[PDB]
Amino acid sequence: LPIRNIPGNYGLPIVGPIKDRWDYFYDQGAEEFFKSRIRKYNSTVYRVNMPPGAFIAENPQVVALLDGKSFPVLFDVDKVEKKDLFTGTYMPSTELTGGYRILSYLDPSEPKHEKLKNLLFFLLKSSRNRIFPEFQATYSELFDSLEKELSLKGKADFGGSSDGTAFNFLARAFYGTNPADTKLKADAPGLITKWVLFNLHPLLSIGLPRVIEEPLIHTFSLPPALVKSDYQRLYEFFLESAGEILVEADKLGISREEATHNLLFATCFNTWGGMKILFPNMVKRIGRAGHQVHNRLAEEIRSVIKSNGGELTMGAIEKMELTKSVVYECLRFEPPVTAQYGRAKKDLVIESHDAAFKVKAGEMLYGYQPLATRDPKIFDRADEFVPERFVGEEGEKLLRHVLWSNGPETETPTVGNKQCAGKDFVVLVARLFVIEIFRRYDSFDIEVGTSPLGSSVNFSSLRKA
Ligand code: HEM
Numbered sequence: 001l002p003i004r005n006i007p008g009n010y011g012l013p014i015v016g017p018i019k020d021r022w023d024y025f026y027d028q029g030a031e032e033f034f035k036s037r038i039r040k041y042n043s044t045v046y047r048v049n050m051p052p053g054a055f056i057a058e059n060p061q062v063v064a065l066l067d068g069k070s071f072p073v074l075f076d077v078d079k080v081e082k083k084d085l086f087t088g089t090y091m092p093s094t095e096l097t098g099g100y101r102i103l104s105y106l107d108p109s110e111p112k113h114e115k116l117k118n119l120l121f122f123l124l125k126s127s128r129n130r131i132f133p134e135f136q137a138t139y140s141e142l143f144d145s146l147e148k149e150l151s152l153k154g155k156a157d158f159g160g161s162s163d164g165t166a167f168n169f170l171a172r173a174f175y176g177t178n179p180a181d182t183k184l185k186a187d188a189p190g191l192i193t194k195w196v197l198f199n200l201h202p203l204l205s206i207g208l209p210r211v212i213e214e215p216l217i218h219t220f221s222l223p224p225a226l227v228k229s230d231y232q233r234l235y236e237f238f239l240e241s242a243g244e245i246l247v248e249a250d251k252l253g254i255s256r257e258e259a260t261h262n263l264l265f266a267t268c269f270n271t272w273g274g275m276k277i278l279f280p281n282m283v284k285r286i287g288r289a290g291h292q293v294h295n296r297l298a299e300e301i302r303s304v305i306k307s308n309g310g311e312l313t314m315g316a317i318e319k320m321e322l323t324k325s326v327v328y329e330c331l332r333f334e335p336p337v338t339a340q341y342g343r344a345k346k347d348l349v350i351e352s353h354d355a356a357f358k359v360k361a362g363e364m365l366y367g368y369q370p371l372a373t374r375d376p377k378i379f380d381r382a383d384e385f386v387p388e389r390f391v392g393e394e395g396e397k398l399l400r401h402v403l404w405s406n407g408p409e410t411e412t413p414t415v416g417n418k419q420c421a422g423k424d425f426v427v428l429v430a431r432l433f434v435i436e437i438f439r440r441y442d443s444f445d446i447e448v449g450t451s452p453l454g455s456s457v458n459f460s461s462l463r464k465a
């Protein structure tokens, strides 16, 4: 391929980044922010400032990788460092996480990265026999509550009930603990939300005018001290609930304190936060796919479950072709976490589809995943949600291009990479979500809107079987 100069510029100091930040949050939004510049530069690889800049990030300058050929460089640990850039060009204060640099911020070359990731592998593996009955029991309550709300109001706010459900499910599946039986009561969603806000506010817009938002959440960090006691409530819950997992932490040579802050982060930020983005988006997309798709999903899931003697099992789910594919299409069409960063360890040649580009050691690389996963030179009808995309031998090959987990879907998280530790779990619970919906309902209608993180979704009808 021809070597090309990386297009784009960073504009003037201070003023360049601010204008790019207004574009990103207010005047264009992220998708059009990235696409308008692809069109301008005639390149899917270019230089751009990324938020937050201001006083929170020291350097907003990145090289954006916005196609599915160049983006995978971000998985390659021989090529990029993955230290302290989970949230990009800035890092939330370790005051927010008990003074620790949590697993998600550690490079694979740090020994504690191996210990902590192995701990989460154990967390997940040791919960395998609770996932099914706990998901089915807690999500059954969710849908009871949603049917109730629909009959009262004529619509049912999904996100307003499903946040509690997700956390209840995680506590019971991961720790055999019902939050209702603890001091947390039903408080966890609110505590986690505030704490996540304190972590992620430099990257978020909450719909307020820019005159308020910019000074309040985009220039300076929100003080960690103001969430410290909310965090302590969550910490004490993990300390008292994580008994069996803490013995294994002890065996792995991890302090009880470090294990607990890490278990909290993994459950509350990685898992519950990812679920908080994913499930309402799934409802939105599946809802938009229409009633014929719902009926086909319903017929598949029910038949397969009946063929399995009414028992839902891991192996039964492998039969549910459209179900597996729909889940994959949700993850491709709309990756829940869109921002992946990596610092070039050495000088690199990054190939895109029509040119190659030279980056120097130390440059921050950034990918906006939905432009890699909706890349029209990799996927046909790339901006269409196609439920059956991954069905059959030929569709399954395309999975290596589904990147939600910070790696190809065909690859496994290891202690050596930075691929999502809960990869298999996420795909599992997302499938169980679809299974629970369509073993109850032949179809549904939604009303949708925007959320600071993902989507705001209402059911306006739920057609029971
Ligand atoms: C639907 C929910 C989830 C979503 C959307 C999601 C997405 C992601 C993404 C994109 C990354 C890469 C971060 C980066 O380096 O830029 C990541 C990393 C990570 N995730 Fe997940 N994830 C989810 C659930 C989970 C679960 C269930 C676990 C269970 C323990 C988990 C644990 C982790 C950990 C420990 C890392 C850092 C990996 C490492 O340092 O090697 N996440 N996740």
Ligand SMILES: CCCCC[C@@H]1O[C@@H]1C/C=C\CCCCCCCC(=O)O
Pocket (backbone or CB within 6 Å): 086, 087, 196, 200, 203, 269, 270, 271, 273, 274, 275, 277, 336, 337, 338, 339, 453
């Ligand atoms: C809300 C919690 C996000 C899900 C957590 C899961 O561990 C991955 C998060 C990876 C990087 C976090 C970046 C924070 C921005 C999240 C929303 C905006 C976006 O999608 O980029």
